[PDB]
Design a protein that fits this description.
- Chains B, C: GO terms for molecular function: host cell surface receptor binding; metal ion binding; structural molecule activity.
- Chains B, C: It is found in: Virion.
- Chains B, C: One of its GO terms (cellular component) is T=13 icosahedral viral capsid.
- Chains B, C: Its main location: virion.
- The structure is cut from a larger assembly and holds one copy of chain A and two copies of chain B.
- Chain A is built from two helices and two strands; from the N terminus they run ααββ.
- Chain A is an alpha+beta fold.
- In chain A, helix 1 crosses helix 2.
- Chain B is of the alpha+beta class.
- In chain B, about 25% of the residues lie in helices and about 30% in strands.
- In chain B, the strands form three sheets. In chain B, strands 3, 4, 5, 6, 7, 8, 11, 12, 13, 14 and 15 form an eleven-stranded mixed beta sheet that branches. Chain B has a two-stranded antiparallel ribbon with strand order 1-2. Chain B has a two-stranded antiparallel sheet with strand order 9-10.
- The two termini of chain B are about 20 Å apart.
- The chains are: A alpha+beta, B alpha+beta.
- At the A-B interface, helix 2 of A face helix 2 of B.
- The structure holds zinc ion.
Chain lengths: ~50, ~400, ~400
């Protein structure tokens, strides 16, 4: 889906852990499945980092 | 305990779901859990056994992950999966036999073996999977102190107690009066007898009563209540109370007049049944009070009138019985019944490896002595060992 | 329940710590918790009472926060704090009286009043504070199913049972033999008597025995064991077993020969004491077995030999007693004792507002009938209502 991490450096770390061939399959699947939680009511946002 | 059930649930599913030729989307969510299990369990060493004749085995886990790249699972993947599964099944078998064999008076609900104390860390918490069996559900609900219920088919709530009571007796033993009973398994067979057949009782009616206290509170019990207890209806010779002499019992059977079956909880009458047989229900109770009475028949044919004289020699003794059989019941504590085999698995493990008698459980795992004095520490030990027996009964057939 | 203790702990500390002239650093961590409490409790409405003569009160919370800008607390801050504290103390007083008055047969450990069911949400979870009292510690430990212990000074573990037993009797009541006892509070006074003083017993020794089963398992009990039970040592006339006639008891006191006090847990002898008096200890037990015996003195002065003839008229009856007083004990379940006043607070609230008898507790809160049949549902209700009584006893003196 669309996905929003909370820093350019955590985007770089996120990319580099997704690209390599030695991290876990659950992890590498999850890096392209984690999703921010932005609520227009209650004035809260949740972002992965 | 949760991670032990999780190991066994994944090994059961991976024997079931990972087969030859099956589609990958059927097993795509199981292989990720099994790989998480392999990743968690690598680098760790365990030691099982060391009590009785249970041998000490050392466990070392160094396995590669399973492939996630097939469309239909071929036989290579099935054979390497069967190797890893057989090693983990042997591991969890020996952990379960190491846990069912141990006990503690202090806090029995805690893990006692070294392997399950090592598995109770948060490093192993990512092994965890669904907790869908009844025993692990009631384990997780009682770990948060909520209400549980184990559904039993014919529960062994009654200890074996075959005895009697003489309300009227003498050393001649020719004019007796009182009750006899058999409490066994889920069945109460009671029979009050009078030798005079109430020939001098007021209004020719003799009142009998039999009160059975339970050890744990049963809930929503279907109970077959029949008259005419079959075991106490044929002639027999019976030793006395002190065991000195024997006395003869030649019964003829009247029907039970004015049956009142009451189901007491804390002395309060929850359910009552007045002269109703067949299947009855008792919603919440821990005491069963049977109140039946023997009434002398006011009209008798000449074949009956020769049985009951007004004088002393009674060769035919009036006897009135009831039978009460709990078919199924929901109990908050663990028990044994005719459906599960968990007590049989616990006793088989404790008798196979020649295990010494510990501080909690009775010698030889006597269920009569275990339900006679069913203390809460013994309850906690019994629930823990039955949960581990359910886990091993999932893996080991 | 946790948030109710937290409300009461902050109100107790804010009556204690927030005083006139005190330094702000002494109260800098309490004012933040009290402001968190005000912020959480605003906008919410409650309704307390509605059973018996307990009046229905509606509670609305609209308060401003307390200032965080003083160095020494002046009297303005103390007066506005005393206003807010008095309103919250009245609120928690009525919530505690609304919770101690209610009960349930189904799940007694759950909150029963509407106000405490409303406080059991996670919106109110930020009220929570330290849980340092013994009852809230044992509440939080039994909410996770761990071992607890309540330390009691002279616990009321024994129901009131003053009765006797005639091992040898006749309608003349001139040659009797058997035991008498008083079980009251924490004290067992037992006395076996023989009228013949073992003149025809084998080896001039009559064995007595008295077995007291407990309702809950006591742990680490200091017990004063003295000989010569004082209550059963003076002459008295006593009604018979059926209450028909009365019989006379003129005791002279021998010392107890061969005292054996055993502390049984599940039928196993945990501790035993053979002819040792003074203070004894019993580490783990739920049955107390006193085995004393009366031995006829083989050498008697002429003042003694006239008391015990070989013939029938015994004007002086041999009597042998023991006294066993549990001074302090640790019990996993709740009880009453001579130190706390929690049972007195519960009965005072239930008797002040004219409360009808419910399904669980005995009529009039009879502690003898409550510990005679001490069911686990009644145990859960008693622990919940004692915890709420401890909370109110912190706030209301
Ligand atoms: Zn069946």
């Amino acid at each position: 889906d669309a996905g929003k991490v909370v820093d350019s450096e955590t985007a770089a770390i996120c990319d580099a852990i997704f690209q390599d061939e030695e991290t876990e399959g659950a992890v590498r699947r999850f890096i392209a499945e984690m999703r921010q939680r932005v609520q227009a009511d209650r004035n809260v946002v949740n972002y992965p980092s | 305990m949760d991670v032990l059930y999780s190991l066994s649930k994944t090994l059961k599913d991976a024997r079931d779901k990972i087969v030859e030729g099956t589609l990958y989307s059927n097993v795509s969510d199981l292989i990720q859990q099994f790989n998480q299990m392999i990743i968690t369990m690598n680098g760790n060493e365990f030691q099982t056994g060391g009590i009785g004749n249970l041998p000490i085995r050392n466990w070392n886990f160094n396995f590669g992950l399973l492939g996630t790249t097939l469309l239909n699972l071929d036989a290579n993947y099935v054979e390497t999966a069967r190797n890893t599964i057989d090693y983990f099944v042997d591991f969890v078998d020996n952990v379960c036999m190491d846990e069912m064999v141990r006990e503690s008076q202090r806090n029995g609900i805690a893990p006692q073996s070294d392997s399950l104390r090592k598995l109770s860390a948060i490093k192993f918490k990512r092994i965890n999977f669904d907790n869908s069996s009844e025993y692990i559900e009631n384990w997780n609900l009682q770990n948060r102190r909520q209400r549980t219920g184990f559904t039993f088919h014919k529960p062994n709530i009654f200890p074996y107690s075959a005895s009697f009571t003489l309300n009227r007796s003498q050393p001649a033993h020719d004019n007796l009066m009182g009750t006899m009973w058999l409490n066994a398994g889920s069945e109460i067979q009671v029979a009050g007898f009078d030798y005079s057949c109430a020939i001098n009782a007021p209004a020719n009616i003799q009142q009998f009563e039999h009160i059975v206290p339970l050890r744990r509170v049963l809930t929503t019990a279907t109970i077959t209540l029949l008259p005419d207890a079959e075991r106490f209806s044929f002639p027999r010779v019976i030793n006395s109370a002190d065991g000195a002499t024997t006395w003869f019992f030649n019964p003829v059977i009247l029907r039970p007049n004015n049956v009142e079956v009451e189901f007491l909880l804390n002395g309060q009458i929850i359910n009552t049944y007045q002269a109703r047989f067949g299947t009855i229900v008792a919603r919440n109770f821990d005491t069963i009070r049977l109140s039946f009475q023997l009434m002398r028949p006011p009209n008798m044919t000449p074949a009956v009138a020769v049985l009951f004289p007004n004088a002393q020699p009674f060769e035919h003794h009036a006897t009135v019985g009831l039978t009460l059989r709990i078919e199924s019941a929901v109990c908050e504590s663990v028990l044994a019944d005719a459906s599960e085999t968990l007590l049989a698995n616990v006793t088989s493990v404790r008798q196979e490896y020649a295990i010494p008698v510990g501080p909690v459980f009775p010698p030889g795992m006597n269920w009569t002595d275990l339900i006679t004095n069913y203390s809460p520490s013994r309850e906690d030990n019994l629930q823990r060992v039955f949960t581990v027996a359910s886990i091993r009964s999932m893996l080991i057939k």
